[PDB]
């Protein structure tokens, strides 16, 4: 390291991944019931 570290410290490691969305495309949407209070 660049300097002295305290005994209570905890180092952490940095990793990176390039992620992608899925293909869950569906052109059909079911008809709603009329909206009301929850």
């Amino acid at each position: 390291f660049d300097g002295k570290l305290k005994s209570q410290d905890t180092v952490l490691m940095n990793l990176y991944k390039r992620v992608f969305p899925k293909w869950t495309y569906d052109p059909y949407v079911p008809e709603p019931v009329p909206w009301l209070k929850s």
Binding site: V11, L12, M13, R18, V19, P27, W35
Partner: protein, 241 residues
């Protein structure tokens, strides 16, 4: 019944876990770290470290279309629809459309009273690409939504079901992934979806169990590109004894 409630409480606990510790992941006990984290890398900086967009594209990206320049394509199409008058039916004409191959189920919807509309697409709006769209949570709803569950999208005269992918809205080159849609700031949902030219309104609906649609997020379509990249971060831990 109860297994959906247990999965929903697991969603709530994941919200508590991912918010205090941002992206911290424990070391796998049995699986070797070089195998589980094989397709991973580390960067010195988070804002200026370069990344190749063409690197490691899966088989799904071979099924969608690409634009050499989306800005020039949008300007070219919008110019020829305002200037050139194509020889067809003019505005105000009472015309009738003979459409080729539709199911009969379209007809019984009209006989029930549901309104039926249609609109002619622009060129290159039937093809598949990756949509980027900005959303903001409705204050009236409080149920959290996860990253990759099914949601109903109303995006520019079109309704479809797909699972989004939430990333932070930042002016940087690469955007950190957001697991849950936080209800204070704008996020970007990336969807494999047909091409829709901006500007177009975006509405998001969560299908309730009793057929109800609850409005979740609202916004507009940001851009149409797959070159936008989402980065998931992992924190490991070690003790300096």
């Amino acid at each position: 019944d109860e297994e959906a409630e247990a999965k929903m409480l697991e969603k709530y606990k994941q919200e508590r876990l991912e918010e205090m510790f941002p992206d911290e992941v424990d070391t796998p006990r049995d699986v070797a770290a070089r195998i589980r984290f094989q397709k991973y890398r580390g960067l010195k900086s988070f804002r200026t470290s370069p990344w190749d967009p063409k690197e490691n594209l899966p088989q799904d990206y071979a099924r969608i279309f690409q634009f050499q320049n989306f800005t020039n394509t949008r300007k070219s199409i919008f110019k020829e629809v305002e200037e050139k008058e194509v020889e067809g039916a003019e505005v105000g004409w009472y015309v009738t459309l003979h459409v080729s191959e539709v199911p009969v189920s379209v007809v019984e919807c009209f006989r029930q009273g549901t309104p039926l509309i249609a609109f002619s697409l622009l060129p290159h709006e039937q093809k598949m690409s990756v949509l980027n769209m900005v959303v903001r949570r409705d204050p009236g709803n409080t149920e959290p939504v996860k990253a990759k569950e099914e949601l109903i999208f109303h995006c520019g005269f079109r309704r479809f079901r797909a699972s989004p992918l939430f990333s932070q809205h930042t002016a940087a080159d690469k955007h950190k992934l957001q697991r849950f849609l936080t209800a204070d700031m704008a996020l970007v949902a990336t969807v494999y979806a047909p091409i829709t030219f901006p500007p177009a309104s975006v509405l998001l609906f969560k299908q309730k169990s009793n057929g109800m649609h609850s409005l979740i997020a609202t916004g507009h379509l940001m851009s149409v590109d797959p070159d936008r990249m989402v980065i998931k971060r992992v924190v490991l831990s070690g003790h300096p004894f």
